[PDB]
Amino acid sequence: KAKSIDQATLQLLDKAKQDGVETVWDRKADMKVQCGFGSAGVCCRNCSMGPCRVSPVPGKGVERGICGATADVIVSRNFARMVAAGTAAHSDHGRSIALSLYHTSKDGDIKVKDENKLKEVAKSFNVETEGRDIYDIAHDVAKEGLSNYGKQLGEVTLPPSLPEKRKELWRKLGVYPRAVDREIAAVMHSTHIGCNADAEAMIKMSMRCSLTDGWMGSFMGTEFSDIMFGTPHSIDTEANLGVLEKNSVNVVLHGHEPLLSEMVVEAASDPELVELAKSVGADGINLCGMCCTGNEVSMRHGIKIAGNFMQQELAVVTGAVDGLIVDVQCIMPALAKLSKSYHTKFITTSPKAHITDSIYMEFDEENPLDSAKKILKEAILNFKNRDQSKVMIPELKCKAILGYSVEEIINKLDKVVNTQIGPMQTVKPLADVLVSGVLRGAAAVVGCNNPKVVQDSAHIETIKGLIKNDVIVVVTGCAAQAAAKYGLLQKEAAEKYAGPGLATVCKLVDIPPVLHMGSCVDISRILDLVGRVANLLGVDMSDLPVAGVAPEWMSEKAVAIGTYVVTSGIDTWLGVAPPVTGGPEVVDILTNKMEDWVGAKFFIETDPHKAVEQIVNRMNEKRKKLGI
Amino acid sequence: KAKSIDQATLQLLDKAKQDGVETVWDRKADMKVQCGFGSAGVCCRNCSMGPCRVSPVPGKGVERGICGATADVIVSRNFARMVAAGTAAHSDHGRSIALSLYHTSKDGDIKVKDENKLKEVAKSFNVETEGRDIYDIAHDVAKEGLSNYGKQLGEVTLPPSLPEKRKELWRKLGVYPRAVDREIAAVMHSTHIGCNADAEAMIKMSMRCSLTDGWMGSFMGTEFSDIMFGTPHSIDTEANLGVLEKNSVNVVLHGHEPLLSEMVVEAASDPELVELAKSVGADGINLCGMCCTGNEVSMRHGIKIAGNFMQQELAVVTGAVDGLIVDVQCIMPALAKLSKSYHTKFITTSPKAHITDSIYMEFDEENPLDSAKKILKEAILNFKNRDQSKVMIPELKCKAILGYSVEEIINKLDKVVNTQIGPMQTVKPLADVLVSGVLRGAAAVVGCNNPKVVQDSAHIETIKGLIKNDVIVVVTGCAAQAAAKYGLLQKEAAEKYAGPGLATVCKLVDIPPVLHMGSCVDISRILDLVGRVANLLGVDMSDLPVAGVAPEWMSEKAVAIGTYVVTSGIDTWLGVAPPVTGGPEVVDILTNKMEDWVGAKFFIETDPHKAVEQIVNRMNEKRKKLGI
Ligand code: SF4
Ligand code: SF4
Ligand code: SF4
């Protein structure tokens, strides 16, 4: 089968074959037929009595592990641990952001750039703002956010966009969230040998844990990032590997933590570093981003996006990356080995993400700007080691428009508001187009790449099908970057791919049919948006014609995201089967019984066209339930 | 191979074969040859690009996972997740204890029974005590303990017995602990795909996480349990399955959390329940404990111990267990199936541990005594369903002495203190016998059973070898219960098994050669003891001739325990190989490089006699280093 639908990706794969280096596709081929027990989730290693593998087919073979655990128990515990790991990644990101907020000052490297957003957040956290210094408010808000992570007494703080009905449903179900780290610890405790051996209770614990990701960790990370670095607005950028410059220093920012990439962007305008780039024979400094850190700097500053997850290696294959600076998460360790075949300096910066044989330059949060400057200086000085005979940059780049935060979307919707009617600054125009049926619904396309799927194929096919069916699409993460590379993040795309209702809406509001809402933590924005719509219509989020899709997901973070999206009341389609087919009870809970609990459920569909059809049918069913 | 060295265990295995019921041994046999990849730790399932298996033999076969992770990376992440799971189990136990402390009242079900212990703990937590109400002090202490779990700013609180040198070494190494749930979340975050791919850093993160178990979670759980339920003192009890009564109601308490078992013990003396037991035709109520909850109630009240981990099923096989009340952890789910073959009521009580097809009676912490009375009444009423023709109780039980908390040990040591010299109430006599060489050292024997080892064989052989070599032995958990069943927890054992120096010490102090220090969380007591000795000698804990042994461990909790014991500076022998042989770098870190870091290291030895020899040699070389 084809490795990708992206032509630049294919050219660089040919180059990697010529250079004798191996990619993620080569390692996937080397893995051959993957273990059936692990693929079905019926393998357990939770204690040293094991490893235990039970039959994925009930009634045949070994039925129980040594402790007596059934296939359903093993599957449910494995699923819960995936959710806990994803929640941990997102919560650690949000915790770093909250600490950065706590360390803001007027004359420091980290300031408050959006005071209005900070005051609204302070209102949401019961922090007084009138007649107060802005940094005192910021510190109080950071304290409340940090308490959300580890409070042992009392209730956590949740955003006002979350409907009261959803909160009450969670409380009745027993999944109402506690402090984030406490829920992660609870999930890890209940999967220990000889604890929870009941699939339904295990799934409910995992949902409870995922809620602390969706509504607390990711939400606080996003809102505090907006406070410190600015709320995203409509902004132009370029996407795909063609953004690399042969005649300039190329600095590629990979990872998830935004403070480092923000400081690197600021350092790139330093006169001394620009002069240094000129002195090593380069035209200038060309910052390019990848994955979620690329999404953040692109949403807030228009930094060009070099590529998504499965392109990271190919960025090095060009031979033009002088410095690849990585913080945490979704950083293929093979990059270190790959960096030996080129001049590239592979720089790790976080104590959480040491990588063997990489150059470690710890990013100092006490002096973020100076630390970023020294890291960037190492990248710039590496330009002298460039071998221009090994350089091949495909001439394939695509224009994209992004920056669609909830605030930006509301500002755009204000155009189609009659002044004599109003109100302004609400999601009411979006609610109106959804209720009238001009738009059939809204769908979130999120997730990673996965060698099991032709890279970016499922993302593009799902998005095109949805917008052709007058479903407005919001995108995050690597799916958003696939849309950017393909050319869907363009106003012109409205008349090229969208159906009649969505084309009319795009023309009236002057937006692309596909709205890039940011990184994987920025999925919280989507929740926020949906919540607002629900609160405007006086219904729960499970009554709306909305859906989420993860066509090509790979990470534990994706599992946690899908779990909290379903738990919030939004049906979720998974384009890659999770390792649960071995447990019939777990499959039945996730795809059938979940609808009785939270009004939504998982759909597993590896065919994107069938997924689009199912999404449209489900949205029409919910519309008929709602009367619209 | 023999299944056990215990004769009562063998008789009940014959009965289980005659009854056509499966045991843990039968399921272990059914599992046959366990997966080599999982056994070596070279299998990874951390993302849905996998499952990935790399060769346990370097230089052959597949070398890297799909993301590029090496065998060392996969092994180190798997080990770290085991540590995180064990830390989560212990920390959740301690968190429940702290919450119970927070709800103590003068006229409530949960009171303060050891005010002196509470005042000393309050001193350790910087809580004022002079001229204050005892329950105000208790609530402040509980608040400080709870803050240890989830504080995001500042430093955690550690017991005064921990040497300053050990803390400084931890700070220099980068493993100084943070809040417990924060460290669990950090480990889970760094094992996520594309985060940490460096074995040394991964092992250091796991050590940092395990410290929050050893010195914060388990320590606080133990000390708060002492405050609420009484400090253990020397007390007599009986051990092994013979403690069951044919003519009495048999109520078996299995699990770890002590509040439920304490309330059940209190409810058993209720006049209405005793009258009800008489009216259902029984002579009375016979409470028996298993595993750690049995250890707690036995340490504090002399409740008879029915058996350790791999005996739990056999307790039901007797046909005499009218009620089996379980809370969390090390509860084989197969019990639910097994109790169908008998009249036994298998009662789950904790929302953390639901077991399918068991009778769920949620233990209400708000009204603990009434809830315990209701559960106990269900067990008593089940006596009418006893089938006395199916009853077979082995006439095999053994006298044991336990209750050796640090306070009790100090009280015993006061006997050999010359009044004209002093001081009293110190560990000084123990330090003196260790320094003079009358005792060669002290060894902690802890851990579970494991079907991979003849049950209780390794525990007994290791203990007998150590005490024969004039090494005083402290025991916890299932190892302590194996010692109890065998008969080592007896004063007479001093003249039957101990060497000359240990026999003299036992005669002078009037103690058994093997000291039962309580449950698995009570391993913190051992740390406390060692710390005091170190603080009395002005040395670090790694300079002492001390060691820990886990001859037959199975649980993730055991992994976390061994990790924090080594990190504290105490060499640890493992009688069951952990899944790390696939990663040569991880093996080298755990067994060789750890000594450079923390002055102690792991020893993997499956032969108990060889383990005793190695322990004696290591203790002698540490003595020669210390000059004693
Ligand atoms: S999933 Fe289990 S059975 Fe399959 S290779 Fe991995 S450890 Fe072995
Ligand atoms: S927890 Fe149970 S099923 Fe899992 S490895 Fe241990 S004995 Fe086997
Ligand atoms: S994290 Fe890497 S090694 Fe582990 S399953 Fe995913 S791709 Fe394979």
Side-chain angles (χ1 to χ4, degrees), chain B residues 400-417:
Chain B
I401 297 181
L402 69 166
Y404 289 99
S405 68
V406 175
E407 295 81 358
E408 174 62 8
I409 291 176
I410 290 173
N411 291 339
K412 297 295 295 183
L413 293 172
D414 279 8
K415 169 190 243 295
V416 298
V417 174

Side-chain angles (χ1 to χ4, degrees), chain A residues 35 37-38 43 45 53, chain B residues 35 37-38 43 45 53:
Chain A
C35 172
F37 297 104
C43 172
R45 298 195 304 265
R53 44 194 180 191
Chain B
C35 172
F37 297 104
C43 172
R45 298 195 304 265
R53 44 195 180 191

Side-chain angles (χ1 to χ4, degrees), chain B residues 7 41 236 259 288 495 568:
Chain B
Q7 186 51 230
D236 303 314
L259 175 58
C288 309
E495 57 263 49
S568 292

Side-chain angles (χ1 to χ4, degrees), chain A residues 181-217:
Chain A
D181 300 328
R182 197 265 173 283
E183 293 294 2
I184 295 168
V187 167
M188 293 301 295
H189 172 206
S190 281
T191 56
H192 185 282
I193 168 64
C195 298
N196 198 79
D198 175 77
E200 163 169 339
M202 196 65 256
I203 301 302
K204 286 180 181 174
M205 289 188 69
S206 76
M207 300 161 60
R208 188 182 204 172
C209 187
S210 82
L211 289 187
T212 78
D213 173 14
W215 291 97
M216 309 169 55

